[PDB]
Amino acid sequence: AVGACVLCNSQTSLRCGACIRRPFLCCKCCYDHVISTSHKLVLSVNPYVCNAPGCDVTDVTQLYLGGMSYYCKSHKPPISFPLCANGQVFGLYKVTDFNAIATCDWTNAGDYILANTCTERLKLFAAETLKATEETFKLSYGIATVREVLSDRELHLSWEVGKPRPPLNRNYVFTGYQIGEYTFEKDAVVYRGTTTYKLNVGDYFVLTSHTVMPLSAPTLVPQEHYVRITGLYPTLNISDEFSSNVANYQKVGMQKYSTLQGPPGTGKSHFAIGLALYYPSARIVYTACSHAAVDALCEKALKYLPIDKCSRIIPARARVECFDKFKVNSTLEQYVFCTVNALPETTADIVVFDEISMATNYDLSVVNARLRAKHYVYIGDPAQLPAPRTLLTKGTLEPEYFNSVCRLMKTIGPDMFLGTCRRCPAEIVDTVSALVYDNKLKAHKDKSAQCFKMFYKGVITHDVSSAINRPQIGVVREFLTRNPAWRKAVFISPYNSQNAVASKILGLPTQTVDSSQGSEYDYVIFTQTTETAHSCNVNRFNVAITRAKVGILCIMSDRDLYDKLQFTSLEI
């Protein structure tokens, strides 16, 4: 009932009753809120409402204090002070940007821009408000009731009329009735049940609207520089493998937090797990937003770190299969590998946060509020894909606005930059180096002479809003008959529905760009599918073509990105 003002920390009894989060506002800051917004309900121990029976005046600007009681202009006694006077709202202990965060619906890019250019307290208010807004939107979607069960991987769905039907991909996980979480792909629909329950007729599926806890810890703790390595103990016997990262590993020990920008295949995994071998006594908690990123870090630890001193932290709600080779849920092991949402409350010599472009400011705050650590290391790449913003429909979110780390990396530069790509044929390294890395990314590999492009707009059909280009898949089919080395290729495209079609016609394994991130395949076939903003996004384009170790075929729709591709062009 009494806390600190989210804009200046000044003590107060005043909360805004109109803000979805109900932030504490001091008398000065609460005034400049209610005088500039549709927000006029103020809360104290008792709410600021006229006390006259049956009176419905709740607007703080139309109210007064009558002794220790509140009344409107129509009910106030002769001796009454206005609640809104000389730049203040009356409360105990007696912002433009706060107003925009408080009142925005989060459908505009400028909203996320402001959520990342504002003060640090207003970054937490923004992340709360947004995450709340994201959840109360999941209510807006219709329920899906099973009409009939066909097979162990297909059924027919009946959708609640009046309420819209959510996009039917992987980024939308339903809660089934709790028969465990479930996902669907396209009148027969393919069902993927986290728990193998023999789907019954009438059983209904609904989207998981989780309760948005409030944020306490900053996105980033304040930066500390040291004179010498602090609370860590280096080796002077350090494997030649990791000799390239010794100067970076010493920067990590001589700062509170550090930023590593690592373009595809520049040895992020290698750097993170090498940090443990360089400070071999140090307790490290390895965290990322996804189970895939954390399981990636587990595979690298398995190779180089002692398996006994490693534990994979899995929450009791088993959502996806993940890493098996460690001891599970031993929080006290020197090496702990855990998704941000499952982190325990503990401390660490070093916390390593990986896949930092996929992290929200909400994730940056949670991490700092569960883990107290001597050193924090932020590993990722602002030139890769951000967390999907399900509410954002107007404007494109630039990398400098993904989170506070990406903002740092794009403005003051990262602390450390892995600058040599060991994965990709030079054709791919040269293209993305120019596209997103201002020509600072170097090829270790030679040109493969197995990187082809083809400009072929084909024909764009849609399943709802997800795009399909059958002619582009026809061009791929033709290529495969003449290029049998590509039989093993991973088919990639920016659209599930295109991948679904390509799966049936080609029989190739299938990946969206967004699900391909952090993976690598010998051969990649990418069809752009459309000329949309989604399919032309340079971060997405970067990830798509940097999945390939040996070869890539890009069938393109965008003249620009086709011409940028430093690949051999094909005819037809």
Known binding residues for Zn(2+): 5, 8, 16, 19, 26, 29, 33, 39, 50, 55, 72, 75
Q: Closest separation between CB of residue 62 and Zn ion, Å?
A: 9
The reply on whether position 391 binds Zn ion by CB under 5 A is no
Q: Select from 14, 42, 43, 72 the one that contacts Zn ion (CB under 5 A).
A: 72
DSSP 130-166: HHHHHHHHHTTSPPEEEEEE-SSS-EEEEE-TTSPPP
Which of the stretches 31-39, 235-243, 329-337, 524-532 binds Zn ion when contact is defined by CB under 5 A? Answer: 31-39
Give me the residue label for tokens 């394994």: 509
Q: Select from 50, 84, 115, 168 the one that contacts Zn ion (CB under 5 A).
A: 50
Q: Closest separation between CB of residue 3 and Zn ion, Å?
A: 11
Residues in contact with 34: Cβ distance below 8 Å, sequence separation at least 6, in sequence order:
16, 40, 42, 60, 61, 84, 89
The reply on whether position 76 binds Zn ion by CB under 5 A is no
Sheet of strand 69-72, all strands in order from the earlier edge strand to the far edge: 69-72, 63-66, 81-82
Q: Closest separation between CB of residue 137 and Zn ion, Å?
A: 19
Cα gap 331→329, rounded to integer Å = 6
Give me the residue label for tokens 């996804």: 290
Q: Closest separation between CB of residue 89 and Zn ion, Å?
A: 11
- Asked if residues 36 and 19 have their Cβ atoms less than 8 Å apart, the reply is no
Q: Closest separation between CB of residue 71 and Zn ion, Å?
A: 6
Q: Select from 21, 24, 29, 284 the one that contacts Zn ion (CB under 5 A).
A: 29
Q: Select from 15, 21, 75, 445 the one that contacts Zn ion (CB under 5 A).
A: 75
- Asked if residues 16 and 102 have their Cβ atoms less than 8 Å apart, the reply is yes
Residues in contact with 117: Cβ distance below 8 Å, sequence separation at least 6, in sequence order:
401, 407
- Asked if residues 249 and 278 have their Cβ atoms less than 8 Å apart, the reply is yes
Measured from the CB atom, the residue of 64 and 378 that comes closer to Zn ion is 64
Cα gap 500→82, rounded to integer Å = 64
H/E stretch holding 273: helix 268-278
- Asked if residues 289 and 355 have their Cβ atoms less than 8 Å apart, the reply is yes
Q: Select from 2, 4, 8, 302 the one that contacts Zn ion (CB under 5 A).
A: 8
Cα gap 336→344, rounded to integer Å = 10
Q: Select from 14, 15, 19, 289 the one that contacts Zn ion (CB under 5 A).
A: 19
The reply on whether position 20 binds Zn ion by CB under 5 A is no
Positions 100 through 159 that interact with Zn ion (CB under 5 A): 102
The reply on whether position 83 binds Zn ion by CB under 5 A is no
How many other CB atoms sit within 10 Å of the CB of residue 480? 17
The reply on whether position 41 binds Zn ion by CB under 5 A is no
Tokens representing 107?
A: 């459908």
Number of H helices, E strands in the chain: 15, 33
Q: Closest separation between CB of residue 43 and Zn ion, Å?
A: 10
Positions 523 through 562 that interact with Zn ion (CB under 5 A): none
Tokens representing 541?
A: 């384009």
Measured from the CB atom, the residue of 59 and 398 that comes closer to Zn ion is 59
The reply on whether position 36 binds Zn ion by CB under 5 A is no
Residues annotated within the binding site for a ribonucleoside 5'-triphosphate are 262-269
Which of the stretches 7-15, 224-232, 501-509, 524-532 binds Zn ion when contact is defined by CB under 5 A? Answer: 7-15
Residues in contact with 112: Cβ distance below 8 Å, sequence separation at least 6, in sequence order:
106, 130, 389, 392, 397, 401
Q: Closest separation between CB of residue 47 and Zn ion, Å?
A: 13
Which of the stretches 1-9, 335-343, 396-404, 414-422 binds Zn ion when contact is defined by CB under 5 A? Answer: 1-9
Which of the stretches 14-22, 60-68, 282-290, 511-519 binds Zn ion when contact is defined by CB under 5 A? Answer: 14-22
Cα gap 216→124, rounded to integer Å = 8
Q: Select from 24, 31, 32, 39 the one that contacts Zn ion (CB under 5 A).
A: 39
Q: Closest separation between CB of residue 45 and Zn ion, Å?
A: 19
The reply on whether position 5 binds Zn ion by CB under 5 A is yes
Positions 218 through 257 that interact with Zn ion (CB under 5 A): none
Residue type, 29: C
Q: Select from 14, 42, 49, 57 the one that contacts Zn ion (CB under 5 A).
A: 57
Q: Select from 4, 35, 41, 52 the one that contacts Zn ion (CB under 5 A).
A: 52
The runs of H, that is alpha helices, within 15-163 are 27-34, 96-103, 109-117, 120-138
Q: Select from 14, 18, 42, 506 the one that contacts Zn ion (CB under 5 A).
A: 18
Measured from the CB atom, the residue of 106 and 205 that comes closer to Zn ion is 106
Write the Ramachandran bin of 202: left for phi over 0, alpha for psi from -120 to 50, otherwise beta: left
Cα gap 355→339, rounded to integer Å = 11
Cα gap 472→106, rounded to integer Å = 35
Positions 85 through 104 that interact with Zn ion (CB under 5 A): 102
Q: Which residues make up the interface to Zn ion (CB under 5 A)? A: 5, 7-8, 10, 16, 18-19, 26, 29, 39, 50, 52, 55, 57, 72, 74-75, 102
